[PDB]
Amino acid sequence: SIRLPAHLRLQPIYWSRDDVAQWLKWAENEFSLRPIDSNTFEMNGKALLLLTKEDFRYRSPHSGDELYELLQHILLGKKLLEAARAGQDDEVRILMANGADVNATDNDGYTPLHLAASNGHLEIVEVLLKNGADVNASDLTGITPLHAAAATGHLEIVEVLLKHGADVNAYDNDGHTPLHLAAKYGHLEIVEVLLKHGADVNAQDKFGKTAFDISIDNGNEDLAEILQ
């Protein structure tokens, strides 16, 4: 599969010169390509998109087409991220049928399964889990799709995640578990199903607060009483 370094996962329309340069450098090692002068592609990412494959070919008689098609590949990863967010089930099909890597990542570590579980698109989450989307991938803040699905209240999505291997005791960079965010947003039934599949109700975050305490600070006392 294909995975940009952390500094290149942004949309290429947003790349600077140096990003474009870092991308060329990166591509040269990954795919095992002959070293070229980056001043050939002397332009920011917004201009790179305007180039034709021939323009790629004549700049790099030895790797121009591969870089053109490589670029095209990452570009579909963004349209897949977008197709999984807006709920565009058809667009998710065409892109996965044209080769979309179902574990792409943007600048925020979001995968297409993160966005489809955070926004409530049950069909996309299932067709992503069926074609190999990582169920326990964590973004740069550590939020898993079960974090996003439990923080937003999507019960049928929290349950489908638990059915394919979603970790119920995953800790984020701030220490929060899926039972913490379900308590933060007042979703008792998700706290129920989380507590059914093995959620450590006594998990502590980096400030020392439990699911009871988050239910206290946010105003969910009926939930705070059920955890007590």
From Swiss-Prot:
What domain of life does the native source organism fall in? Eukaryota
Q: In this chain's numbering, which residues are marked as the site (Breakpoint for translocation to form PAX5-ETV6)? A: 9-10
Q: Where is this site: Breakpoint for translocation to form ETV6-MDS2 in MDS?
A: 8-9
Q: In which tissues is it expressed?
A: Ubiquitous.
PNT domain mapped to chain residues: 1-75
Indicate where this protein resides in the cell: Nucleus
Query: Which region is the signal sequence?
Result: none
User: What does the protein in this record do?
Assistant: Transcriptional repressor; binds to the DNA sequence 5'-CCGGAAGT-3'. Plays a role in hematopoiesis and malignant transformation.
Quaternary structure, per UniProt, is:
Can form homodimers or heterodimers with TEL2 or FLI1. Interacts with L3MBTL1 and HDAC9.
The entry's family comment says: Belongs to the ETS family.
From the record heading the sequence, give the disease linked to this protein.
A chromosomal aberration involving ETV6 is found in a form of chronic myelomonocytic leukemia (CMML). Translocation t(5;12)(q33;p13) with PDGFRB. It is characterized by abnormal clonal myeloid proliferation and by progression to acute myelogenous leukemia (AML).
Q: What is this protein called?
A: Transcription factor ETV6
Q: Which organism is it from?
A: Homo sapiens
Q: Which gene encodes it?
A: ETV6
Placed within the complete protein, the shown segment runs: 47 to 121 of 452
